[PDB]
């Protein structure tokens, strides 16, 4: 059975590759040659968020568009008021090492994850005090890399064991598990409709997973290195990936292959954080050379550079209305650019 | 009122400074090795589902944090980037002369890592008694695994312990040279390796780690206090 198993696998791979090639008529570069370029854009650091101890790995933006949660490996979760720079909460964590943090759309709960293989859920509206430990989402055999909130009761966690799991807060058990990936999953993003989500793993493949069905629909293998950050286009249909190959590639769920790649000869460092502006033109990618580069989604042009950080910009997030971008780096400071 | 929010932020500032004093005064250590390595015994030698194990031990008024990531996937190229703030990485090498080549490969990967290029690593060659008895038996074909051992000889500057067979010291120093060559291949000098000898029962491991951390902090002070 084995020989024809690989034979059929290779035949299906070739068939899908040929179908994708035939599905390509004109590249995104050619069709967008006539569009007006964004040009050089300069954004200043409006707010610097001093107060964190260790290097900062992840951050997230709330639906109120001015409250953000910053996760640092010092063992603290901090909610920063972007408009007024004051700190709303300072959550002490059970484990110092954390690799992700999530802000619920309703704002009632905040989550985090790391090397503990446990997603810690913290509530903010509790009358008993400031912050209390809701419950631990134990069950993962790999280090958690990225967590996002669908609702107040549904959360999806990406762990370093090739498994993506959807957890129910009320029950505290794995509702559904996804094991289609072959490498360590580094990031996941949720579409605005909360019906589809894509997870990037350390296998140069981005897989679209169904929150309800639980089946993997599309796999995008256009990369050549480990994908670190993945995030949807605001339309909820396309997405882009940032890998260690110093190139950013945009994928759409209709074409099922890469549309445009973002790269430069002067960049030899990988991408660890990626996000889109609300219009989607400004693709923000966090590189390893201590700065953030602004990439035009439809033109692949260097619109601008955010060189306000002296260390790796591990995390990057954009407000739900696109008012400003808070970039967190390993210097224990968050810089908000507008 | 926003003034009360500012007061709360100032209280959070005070708390963050108060526990940042503790965070700065404490020292973080990373424990790494292999399945055959005696990292499980080293942890038990320190006395005052989860992917990372935290161990508390203090010697001479200073406390240390060791993190063991044994219960994790072996694909360690990603979570290792989180340990940049760690003062030193404790490496355990099994001297079963073969998992030694894997130990050298892991040491090379750690030393040449971009994020780990500013971190000194402490190497502990555990189970030295097993290596000594194996090389005393003579059935081990150590020359076959490493052809360099055939021509290498014990340096005149060696300091063997009393009651130690000369071939035991020769093999130990050959392993030390094999690790030191990888350590000094880069030649940057930002971080320094600390070869050491240890066994399953050794109460001086804490003292050795204390001395290595002291030397590392001295080098850091030279780097940061305009003294290098």
């Amino acid at each position, epitope marked *: 059975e084995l020989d024809q198993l690989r034979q059929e696998a290779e035949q299906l791979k070739n068939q899908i590759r040929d179908a994708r090639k035939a599905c390509a008529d004109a590249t995104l570069s050619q069709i967008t040659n006539n569009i007006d370029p964004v040009g050089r854009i300069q954004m200043r650091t409006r707010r610097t968020l001093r107060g964190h101890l260790a290097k900062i790995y992840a951050m997230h933006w709330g639906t109120d568009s001015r409250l953000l949660v910053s996760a640092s490996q010092d063992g603290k979760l901090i909610i920063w008021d972007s408009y007024t720079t004051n700190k709303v909460h300072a959550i002490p964590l059970r484990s110092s090492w954390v690799m992700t943090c999530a802000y619920a759309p309703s704002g009632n709960y905040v989550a985090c994850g790391g090397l503990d293989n446990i997603c810690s859920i913290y509530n903010l509206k509790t009358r008993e005090g400031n912050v209390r430990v809701s419950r631990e989402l134990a069950g993962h055999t790999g280090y958690l890399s990225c967590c996002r909130f669908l609702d107040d009761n549904q959360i999806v966690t990406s762990s370093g064991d090739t498994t993506c799991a959807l957890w129910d807060i009320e029950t505290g058990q794995q509702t559904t598990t996804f094991t289609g990936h072959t490498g360590d999953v580094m990031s996941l993003s949720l579409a605005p409709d909360t019906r589809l989500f894509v997870s990037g793993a350390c296998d140069a493949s981005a897989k679209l997973w169904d929150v309800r069905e639980g089946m993997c629909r599309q796999t995008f293998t256009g990369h050549e*290195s480990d994908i670190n950050a993945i995030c949807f286009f605001p339309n909820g249909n396309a997405f882009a990936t940032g890998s*260690d190959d110093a190139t950013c590639r945009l994928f759409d769920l209709r074409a099922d292959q890469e549309l445009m790649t973002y790269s430069h000869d002067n960049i*030899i460092c990988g991408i660890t954080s990626v996000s889109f502006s609300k219009s989607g033109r400004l693709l923000l990618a966090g590189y390893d050379d201590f700065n953030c580069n602004v990439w035009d989604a439809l033109k692949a042009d260097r619109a601008g550079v955010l060189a306000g950080h002296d260390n790796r910009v591990s995390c990057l997030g954009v407000t739900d209305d696109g008012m400003a971008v808070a970039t967190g780096s390993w210097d224990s400071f968050l810089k908000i650019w507008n | 009122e926003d003034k009360a929010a500012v007061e709360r932020s100032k209280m959070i500032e005070k708390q963050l400074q108060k526990d940042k004093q503790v965070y700065r005064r404490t020292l973080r250590l990373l424990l790494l090795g292999a399945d055959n390595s005696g990292k499980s015994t080293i942890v038990k030698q320190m006395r005052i589902t989860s992917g990372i194990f935290e161990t508390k031990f203090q010697v001479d008024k200073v406390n240390f944090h060791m993190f063991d990531v044994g219960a994790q996937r072996d694909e360690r190229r990603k979570w290792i980037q989180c340990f940049n703030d760690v003062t030193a990485i404790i490496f355990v090498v099994d001297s079963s002369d073969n998992r030694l080549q*894997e130990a050298l490969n892991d040491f090379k990967s750690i030393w*040449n*890592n971009r994020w780990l290029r500013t971190i000194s690593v402490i190497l502990f060659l555990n189970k030295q008694d097993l290596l000594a008895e194996k090389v005393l038996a003579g059935k081990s074909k150590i020359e076959d695994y490493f052809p360099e051992f055939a021509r290498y000889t014990t340096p005149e500057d060696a300091t063997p312990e009393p009651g130690e067979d000369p071939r035991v010291t020769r093999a130990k120093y050959f392993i030390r040279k094999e690790f030191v060559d990888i350590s000094t291949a880069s030649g940057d000098g930002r971080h320094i390796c600390y070869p050491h000898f240890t066994c399953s029962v050794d109460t001086e491991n804490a003292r050795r780690i204390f001395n290595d951390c002291k030397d590392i902090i001295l080098q850091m002070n030279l780097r940061e206090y305009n003294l290098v």
Partner: nanobody
Framework: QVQLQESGGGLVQPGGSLRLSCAASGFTFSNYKMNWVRQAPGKGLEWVSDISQSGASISYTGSVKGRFTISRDNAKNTLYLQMNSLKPEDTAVYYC?????????????????????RGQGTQVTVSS
């Protein structure tokens, strides 16, 4: 997608010569450090030899030091490994593996838990 299609091998008499070739595709070959990893029956995966991006830095394991040589051809994106003085202990399956990130000297290909950037490999058997 990364495609490391190992070619060459088969049954060879001890002490003979054997060559293995890998058809690198889907990536820029010259920007990644390449190496060979073998898996023996009843044994774990071990690193064999590695070659730098430009081939200036080449290292081999002590078991096959000198006997084996590794060469790369960035023009056609192919990695070569010539075998000399085979011994019965060398029977195994060899996987051509690639470093995950470009412009780095790190090696994480020793892992055997379904590494993403290694090919299916070719089985080589030595027997009199």
């Amino acid at each position: 997608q990364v495609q490391l299609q190992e070619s060459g091998g088969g049954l060879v008499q001890p002490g003979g010569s054997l060559r293995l070739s890998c058809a690198a595709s889907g990536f820029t070959f010259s920007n990644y450090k390449m190496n060979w990893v073998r898996q023996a029956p009843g044994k774990g995966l071990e690193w064999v030899s590695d070659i730098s991006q430009s081939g200036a830095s080449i290292s081999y394991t002590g078991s096959v030091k000198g006997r084996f040589t590794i060469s790369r051809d960035n023009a056609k994106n192919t990695l070569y490994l010539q075998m000399n003085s085979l011994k019965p202990e060398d029977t195994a399956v060899y996987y051509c593996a690639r470093c995950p990130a470009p412009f780095t000297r790190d090696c994480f290909d020793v892992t055997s838990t379904t590494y993403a950037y290694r090919g299916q490999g070719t089985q080589v058997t030595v027997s009199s």
